[PDB]
From a paper:
Here, we used the proton-gated ion channel GLIC to identify the conformational changes that occur during gating in the family of pLGIC channels. GLIC has been crystallized in three conformations (called open, closed and locally-closed) and studied by molecular dynamics, normal mode analysis and EPR spectroscopy.
When the bimane is introduced at position 135 (loop B), the pH-fluorescence relationship curve shows an inverted bell-shape, starting after normalization at 0.7, decreasing down to 0.3 at pH 5–4, then increasing up to 0.6 at pH 3. The data indeed show that the bimane is at a minimal 3.2 Å distance from the indole ring of W72, which is therefore most likely the major partner in the pH-elicited fluorescence changes of Bimane-135. As the 135 side chain projects at the subunit interface, the quenching of Bimane-135 by W72 seen up to pH 4 suggests a contraction of the domains interfaces, driving the bimane moiety toward W72, although other mechanisms are possible. At very low pH, the bimane appears to move away from the W72. The bimane labeled GLIC V135C was crystallized in the same conditions as WT GLIC.
Numbering used by the authors:
A (entry chain C), B (entry chain D), C (entry chain E), D (entry chain A), E (entry chain B): 5 to 315
Write the structure that this text describes.
């Protein structure tokens, strides 16, 4: 058991293919997903070749220990894949067809800038380290790349599973390394965010705006402050589903902006109350009247400016 | 070892059975369940046939490594079954009788549209990959498919555990696979949702309707804003027990509709105050007297419309 | 290695014993507990008998692989017993003495009807599948059943640890099975529930009843609505410590009933206000006075009936 | 492999030593802690003795399997010590010196009566079961019992790490067991409980006492009920850090006593209003004037009583 | 297997290298992180010398079991380094080049004094115990120490990953120990804390300050008491993300000091009302007008003092 020697000075080509059986547990905070797939490996080992006419047998089956198998590891896995060899088949010309079913927790970063209207490119990097004798290079067997029809990822729409055919051949620790980029394209199912977070968040805001058709300070203070407490509950709820990002997200931007609206609604209610008491209810009346228009208008404009800057 | 060779060109039939010992951890969010069971496998191996006279035994026992055992895998498992071999019995005619105990975390999707009055079909998919030498096909021994009477799933009623006798034969990575479907039929114990969520949620909503028999804006603002906040707490409570769906759930639809009632109630409470300050209490009294009948009637009709759409 | 042959037509008796070293992590929601114990097994293997006079030795020690050891399993375990053999000692007459230390996560159902004044009988089921050669039956050596004095289950009182001596012998999948039931009797330490849940829930209820000595609607609405919010927090807290049950638990019934009290207090506070505005304070004052007695009287009588129906 | 035979009838002495490398994860609810340490064992096995002159080596190194090593176990571990043998050295006189690196999750009860001003004695119980051939006894080599200087336990001060030199020899299932007690003495770092829980809790209590300088029932009902609701939040927060105990903790006692204050303050607030409504504001004023002193005085006294009964 | 012999009285030098592939799960409460890296080891074993002309090959490849490998361990790991040998390469002079891929949960203490504007120096300690035969000493091959350009730590910026080349050679349990210190430098991405915690906390504080432009006690009590409860919820939120420290953190100091502001504001609100009721509103007016400046000014200066004391 050693690497097959080169006929010419060319490197050994290991043809690879990942076929997803199950995809599950997409954790946003962890920036990880779990997977259950087939890993297909194919290379030519002439030392294994045989005569089809003399032998009579079309294909030969070997055990992993018996023959040389390349060390294909995963770059971005949390804990090293639970592998189980399914098949090793040699053709008369010495072409080896390897197949293992594995499962791995893959650490792939996410871009939350457009959350919950985001799309992500999940990655699964395959790698091979070349030895002192000869270089090993990875290739994509597009016939052996894919995903089973039923494959679902709770909370997401699965768009594609395609590998980048050209490997990344680079030298790390004075040895050649061949890296392949498999890509799982997914788009988030935003539907639930509308009845459970967005619409409730807007209702409570519109309720704070009924203070603009009220002269009762005590009621207004109750309106604006109670609803601001329910806004904090939602901000908190939202941030528990997401990691701490060094940029603003879309929901994050709306949520923050709404705080300023509360602060101003509070100011307005204070000003209105101060003018009444100072016996200026007509000046106060003019400010509430403008506020009935300004507050929903400036809200609608600011939300457009945001949607534009994010999409 | 190699698979038993065919007499003619027939496929190799492996009779299967699953016997549930324990069922536990139905996790709605992750759409999984844990299982503890027996797995029975049976197949003819002529190379193992023996004469009972010159052996003095009706059956022979073997170690898994001693004979050929079919590579039977599970399709929908989070982590590959923890398996232990119990018994291996070879009859005189060469009929092998395998038995193992396994435990696995199974990934099977759920339909939350009628939550929490829903039923589910839990699947356990058994599979076998065919060989170049010969094609392997799965079968169901109906006398070896069951569950003991003690088997319980916390918060669920276990209805049935049956298998779809006809395997789905198809090609995968240029080899024939034979897939079997074991179906565990469960229905949710909705009981607890009534005194813990449904009724508490209705009581706080009815409590907001007492504002229709009150002339006090300050009081009304307290009644409608404080109950709206307890409703937000139930919305959050409910959505913790469930995953994000691209569809509306039954509970979720009731929960959403109830926010509209709070919004309209705030409007009526607002309108009534405005009219009373404008020295139009007679108009306001008409709106409030109407609301007293309108709010319970519209609620009662809307719930009939929803129960009908969902069931 | 093969099972010992019978002298008469009799089955092989494997004498069992479980000695608890540690008990921990009783999870009410999961309906599981963890244990660390000794599993003692004893049977006669004539093939191992020897002469004490000539051998000089009393006992002969073996490694597990050297001799035949019966296949004893646990029916109700989530994560399979992590075993390590401590001793195998053979007496001159061939009586084998097996002793292993194991740890398992046992799945035993719990009856929450009387929570938090509940008592449970946790079970550990030992099992053995009989061979085609001969039948194996389990038995209890009471001399090797018990527990360490330092055994504690946080939040519980350990009452007893006995075994049901008569095994349950039944036919499962055309083979005989022998089942033993070890019973760990515990009673819940209700103490904490009094100063943390029960009494705080009563204080807030009584605070709602101070509205019966008040003529301020605005104040009463705050009293009953605020305390109802704190009541919900306790309902939520309580139900997070428990699994969803298809029956009413004791605390569950009390917590539910208290909602009816708040609902009726809101009705009274509403009615009293309505009359005051309708310029009928005399009738209002009559209802408020009757409510001062009616509410704590009906609460006391409702609780007596509940305590009676539960205990 | 059997134990060394007794020269005279004396039992075999195994000298033990635990040296802490890392201490982490003290879990109050689970009453566990995790440790990373060296375990050293030393015993005389004459069957291994050698002459330094003839052999030309003063030390002899063996594999665990090659010689006899005592089966030393831990009594109170959840999941059994993950051990890797570092070295086994035999001196010319046959004095075996064994060293291993282990890591275990140790179960050891905690006394919460003085929380968060408490001190704990964590135990690590080493044990040995004797043979039918001969008796085994444990000893402590005080030269090999310690901890690294950088050893820390998050939120705790490490006081000591010593062993109770005299074992606790006893009968278990008619065999001698020698048990040793290693003790890790720790005291909880209470510092952060002060700004995070104690002082916040006192501030909201003192804020409820401002109701005593207010004639406004409506404002008073707000002060006392809102602060009562924040007290429930701290009661809840605190009890999520602790297991349920059948005794009262220090913080628990203060937390409970503080509820009784809230109830009495509600009564005073209620009574004051009643008298004012009855045109008795003079009687009501004297009750409120008494309350202003009585509440802080009865509070400071009851805390003196409590600190005395707890420390 | 035993250590290679020395040519002279020199110790055996083992060259080390750690190459980070993945860094993840920085858990503040636990004071841990998870890493996935390459561990390179290099030492001379002349007993392994060979002739390339005789053997055929220029480099020999071995199985770990076939040769002596130094017992290099990690000091501060919670989860056992899940290791897998990638390559073992022996050159003609006997120079061994060992490559293993590992993953571990490193426990390294964090200083939260400047949280969330803090920086950390995470450590991975390599170690080796010396034999009686000969001493082993660790060394750093700077050419094999590093991290892949993609390495990211969610919520942190990775500054550097270098080693402290001079090992800590010391005595432990009468044997030589050689320790290496690999240091991973990180600075916390404070961005998210501003829109999610810091500014929402300031908005609610300023909302309470509107009570200085109000003569309404019932409203003011609502303003200061409601925002105080929202502050409590932030304090609870902040401390769920942090361990209990025996010192004050920066956020912790601000959070605490802000409660003193809420307490003083309540005092002023109480004073203002008392005077207004005592028929001295002019005095109240002077206290309220001063408060309008004093509260923001004392808040400004207090934060300047704090920021100066912490940074
Ligand atoms: C609070 C203020 C209201 C927030 C409105 C959310 C607007 C959603 C952003 C948007 O227009 O498009 C983003 C998204 C995504 O943008 P995209 O164009 O990148 O989508 C590409 C999708 N694939 C890859 C599958 C082809 O567009 C939508 O799908 C529209 C979302 C539905 C409309 C939102 C409903 C909000 C109802 C409340 C008002
Ligand atoms: C609010 C205080 C505004 C004081 C303005 C003033 O003195 O007006 C007197 C004069 C007289 O009033 C007016 O005619 C103008 C009143 C405008 C007030 C409404 C401002 C709303 C802006 C939306 C903010 C959205 C959040 C970001
Ligand atoms: C409020 C109920 C309406 C008052 C009834 C009425 O018209 O009374 C007029 C007459 C005059 O009032 C009375 O004397 C009757 C007062 C009834 C008070 C109701 C208290 C019920 C307590 C049980 C609650 C527990 C629920 C289970
Ligand atoms: C439980 C512990 C309850 C303690 C109640 C303390 C009452 C203190 C009375 C103070 C006093 O003397 O005030 C005189 C004065 C009396 O005024 P007066 O003497 O001018 O005129 C009396 C007029 N009539 C006859 C109509 C009443 O003040 C009051 O009016 C007292 C108001 C306090 C109201 C307290 C209500 C507490 C509600 C909780 C009930 C709990 C029931 C528990 C049942 C459990 C069943 C399982
Ligand atoms: C029973 C409640 C009686 C109400 C008081 C009353 O009638 O006062 C009349 C008399 C006249 O009023 C007074 O002068 C005394 C005022 C009572 C102040 C009570 C303070 C108790 C503080 C301890 C609370 C914590 C409990 C532990
Ligand atoms: C409002 C009250 C909270 C104030 C928090 C801001 C204070 C943090 C500033 C700081 O020390 O930053 C150092 C950290 C980096 O740590 P550093 O330690 O490099 O800072 C240099 C300190 N000396 C001179 C001692 C070496 O951040 C920066 O680089 C400055 C940007 C801080 C941005 C703060 C924005 C606050 C906006 C909310 C209002
Ligand atoms: C006045 C202000 C009051 C503030 C109110 C804020 C309410 C906050 C409610 C948080 C609910 C907790 O739930 C938050 O969301 C998702 C579930 O949806 C969690 O996700 C969790 O799901 C499951 C089930 O709960 C857990 O077993 C698992 O450990 C975790 O992955 C986040 O880890 C948690 O942080
Ligand atoms: C306006 C309304 C406001 C409503 C606010 C309600 C607040 C509710 C606070 C919930 C308290 C936190 O929730 C607490 O979480 C811990 C996990 O850390 C759970 O922990 C539990 O786990 C297992 C299940 O895995 C249980 O069998 C076990 O008894 C317990 O240890 C507690 O059962 C839950 O009570
Ligand atoms: C992972 C675990 C997650 C745990 C989640 C914890 C949830 C905590 C929810 C806290 C909800 C607090 O909700 C709080 O209730 C009070 C009850 O008086 C309500 O307060 C209401 O009454 C008071 C009078 O008593 C008024 O001052 C206030 O204006 C009014 O809104 C508020 O609407 C809200 O500030
Ligand atoms: C073809 C075949 C069968 C059925 C079998 O058991 N073995 C193996 O183990 C391999 C993977 C192959 C091929 N064969
Ligand atoms: C003496 C000895 C050794 C060799 C061993 O492993 N154990 C056991 O398992 C027993 C029963 C005895 C004694 N010891
Ligand atoms: Br891998
Ligand atoms: Br499987
Ligand atoms: Br088992
Ligand atoms: Br152990
Ligand atoms: Br290690
Ligand atoms: Na190989
Ligand atoms: Na086989
Ligand atoms: Na055996
Ligand atoms: Na080795």
């Amino acid at each position: 058991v050693s690497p097959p020697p080169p006929i010419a000075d060319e490197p050994l080509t290991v043809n690879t293919g990942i076929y997803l059986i199950e995809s599950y547990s997409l954790d946003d905070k962890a920036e990880t997903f779990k997977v259950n797939a087939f890993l297909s490996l194919s290379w030519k080992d002439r030392r294994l070749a045989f005569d089809p006419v003399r032998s009579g047998v079309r294909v030969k089956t070997y055990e992993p220990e018996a023959i040389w198998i390349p060390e294909i590891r995963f770059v971005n896995v949390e804990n090293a894949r639970d592998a189980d060899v399914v098949d090793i088949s040699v053709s008369p010309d010495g072409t080896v067809q390897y197949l293992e079913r594995f499962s791995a927790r893959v650490l792939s970063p996410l871009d939350f800038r457009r959350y919950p209207f985001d799309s992500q490119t999940l990655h699964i990097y395959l790698i091979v380290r070349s030895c002192d004798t000869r270089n090993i290079v990875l290739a994509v067997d597009l016939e052996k790349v894919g995903k089973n029809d039923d494959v679902f990822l709770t909370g997401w729409d699965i768009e594609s599973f395609t590998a980048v055919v050209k490997p990344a051949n680079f030298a790390l620790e004075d040895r050649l390394e061949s890296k392949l980029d498999y890509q799982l394209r997914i788009s988030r199912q935003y539907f639930s965010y509308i009845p459970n977070i967005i619409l409730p968040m807007l209702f409570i805001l519109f309720i704070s705006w009924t203070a603009f058709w009220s002269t009762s300070y005590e009621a207004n203070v109750t309106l604006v402050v109670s609803t601001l407490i329910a806004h904090i509950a939602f901000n908190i709820l939202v941030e528990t589903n997401l990691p701490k990002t060094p940029y603003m997200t879309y929901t994050g931007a709306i949520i923050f902006m709404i705080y300023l609206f509360y602060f101003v609604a509070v100011i307005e209610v204070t000003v209105q109350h101060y003018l009444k008491v100072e016996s200026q209810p007509a000046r106060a009346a003019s400010i509430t009247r403008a506020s009935r228009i300004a507050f929903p208008v400036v809200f609608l404009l600011a939300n457009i400016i945001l949607a534009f800057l994010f999409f």
